[PDB]
Design a protein around this ligand. Structure first.
Ligand SMILES: [Cl-]
Ligand SMILES: [Cl-]
Lengths: 256, 125
C-alpha cells in the first residue's frame, strides 16, 4: 500500500491543519534534490510505481471517510476512494493511465471519468469559477460528504466538480505554496469561508512555469520575468527566486 | 477557447514564412486573452511560447526552443487577440499548431500545459 495521511474537519484548528499539510509535504518529496532552497518533487522518469503515489484520507463531523490519491511528481489529485467505489480523472497519456491501475486495487468498482482534473474543465462542470467557490473548513466538510455520497446518484456532477476544486486547492495547492497554506490557516483560525483571491489563483495557474524558471534560472535570476496578481487584482512581475522563498514550497522536477 | 492558425503554405528552402493564430471565445470574456499564455508546436515538438506583460519594459515576453532560437521569432498584438510565428531560414516541414491556456506562456514547453488547441496549418519547405 501507499502512505496514508489523515485529516478531519471535525474540531479542526490552525495547528491540526498545519500538521496535516507538513505531513503531506514530508511524504511527497525525499527532501533531497533542493534548488535555491526549495525542495523539488521526484522525477516522473524511472520512478518505481510503488513510490508514485500517496494517499490522503479525509473525514468530517458527519463521521464520513474519503481517500484521495496524489501523484508525488506534481502533488495533484488523480482520483479518490469512497467506501466500495474508486474514481479516476482522465489520464493525459497511456503511461499515466497504466500508472493509476496500481491504485485502490483494494476495490471491485473502478471508474475513469471522461474528463480530466484541470481547473477549466471542473469549473465548467461546476458552473462556477474558482473565484466564486468558497474555501475553508466549512466547504471542505461539505466537499467530503458529497464525494462520499456520489455512488448513490444523490450528489450531482456539478456538486462533485465543485468539491474537487475545493479539495485540490486546500490540499494540493496548500502543499505547493506556503502562501496558500497560510490562506487556509487564516480561514480556519477565524472560522470563515471565502473564495480565493486573484493572488491565490494566479499562483495556481503559474506553478508549473515558476518551477521551470527557478530551476533553469541563471543563479536565481529568471531569463524573463513572470507576471502575477495581487489581492486587489493589480498585476506585478517577479524577476528572481529570492522573492518566492516564503511563498512556494514544492516544485515539479525539471532538467537539468 | 478557440484558435485558428493560418499562413501555412509551401516555401522554398532557405526562405521565410509567418504563421498567424487568432483566438476567440467566451471567457475572454480575470480570464481575458491577456491572461492566457500561447505556445506554438509542430510526434509534437515545442516551438516557442509567449506571455503578455504590462510592466514597464516589454508588452510581451517570448520563449524559443534552442534549435529554433536564431531563426524563428514570436510576436503578438494583444488588442486583436492574435499571435505570430516568424520563421526565417526554413529547411522544418510539419503541421504547426497554436495552443493557449492559463498555465501556458513562457516556461511552458509541454503539450499538457495548454488547455486549448488549434486545427493546425501545414508548412512545407
Ligand atoms: Cl483505471
Ligand atoms: Cl546537471
Amino acid at each position: 500500500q501507499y502512505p496514508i495521511i489523515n485529516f478531519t474537519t471535525a474540531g479542526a484548528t490552525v495547528q491540526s491543519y498545519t500538521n496535516f499539510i507538513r505531513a503531506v509535504r514530508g511524504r511527497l518529496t525525499t527532501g533531497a534534490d533542493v534548488r535555491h532552497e526549495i525542495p523539488v518533487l521526484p522525477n516522473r522518469v524511472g520512478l518505481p510505481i510503488n513510490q508514485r503515489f500517496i494517499l490522503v484520507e479525509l473525514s468530517n463531523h458527519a463521521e464520513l471517510s474519503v481517500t484521495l490519491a496524489l501523484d508525488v511528481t506534481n502533488a495533484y489529485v488523480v482520483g479518490y476512494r469512497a467506501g466500495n467505489s474508486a474514481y479516476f480523472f482522465h489520464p493525459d497519456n497511456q503511461e499515466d493511465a497504466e500508472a493509476i491501475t496500481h491504485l485502490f486495487t483494494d476495490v471491485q468498482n473502478r471508474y475513469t471519468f471522461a474528463f480530466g482534473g484541470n481547473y477549466d474543465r471542473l469549473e465548467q462542470l461546476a458552473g462556477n469559477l474558482r473565484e466564486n467557490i468558497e474555501l475553508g473548513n466549512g466547504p471542505l466538510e461539505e466537499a467530503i460528504s458529497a464525494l462520499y455520497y456520489y455512488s448513490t446518484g444523490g450528489t450531482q456532477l456539478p456538486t462533485l466538480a465543485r468539491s474537487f476544486i475545493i479539495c485540490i486547492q486546500m490540499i494540493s495547492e496548500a502543499a505547493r505554496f506556503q502562501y496558500i497554506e497560510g490562506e487556509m490557516r487564516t480561514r480556519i483560525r477565524y472560522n470563515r469561508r471565502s473564495a480565493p483571491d486573484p493572488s491565490v489563483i494566479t499562483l495556481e495557474n503559474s506553478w508549473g512555469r515558476l518551477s521551470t524558471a527557478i530551476q533553469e534560472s541563471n543563479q536565481g535570476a529568471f531569463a524573463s520575468p513572470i507576471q502575477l496578481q495581487r489581492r486587489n487584482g493589480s498585476k506585478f512581475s517577479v524577476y528572481d527566486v529570492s522573492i518566492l522563498i516564503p511563498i512556494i514550497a514544492l516544485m515539479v522536477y525539471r532538467c537539468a | 477557447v478557440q484558435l485558428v492558425e493560418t499562413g501555412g503554405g509551401v516555401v522554398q528552402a532557405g526562405g521565410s514564412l509567418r504563421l498567424s493564430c487568432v483566438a476567440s471565445g467566451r471567457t475572454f470574456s480575470g480570464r481575458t486573452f491577456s491572461d492566457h499564455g500561447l505556445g506554438w508546436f509542430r510526434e509534437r515538438e515545442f516551438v516557442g511560447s509567449i506571455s503578455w506583460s504590462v510592466d514597464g519594459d516589454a508588452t510581451y515576453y517570448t520563449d524559443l526552443a534552442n534549435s529554433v532560437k536564431g531563426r524563428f521569432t514570436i510576436s503578438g498584438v494583444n488588442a486583436k487577440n492574435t499571435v505570430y510565428l516568424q520563421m526565417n531560414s526554413l529547411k522544418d516541414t510539419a503541421v504547426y499548431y497554436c495552443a493557449a491556456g492559463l498555465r501556458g506562456g513562457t516556461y511552458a514547453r509541454t503539450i499538457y500545459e495548454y488547455d486549448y488547441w488549434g486545427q493546425g496549418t501545414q508548412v512545407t519547405v
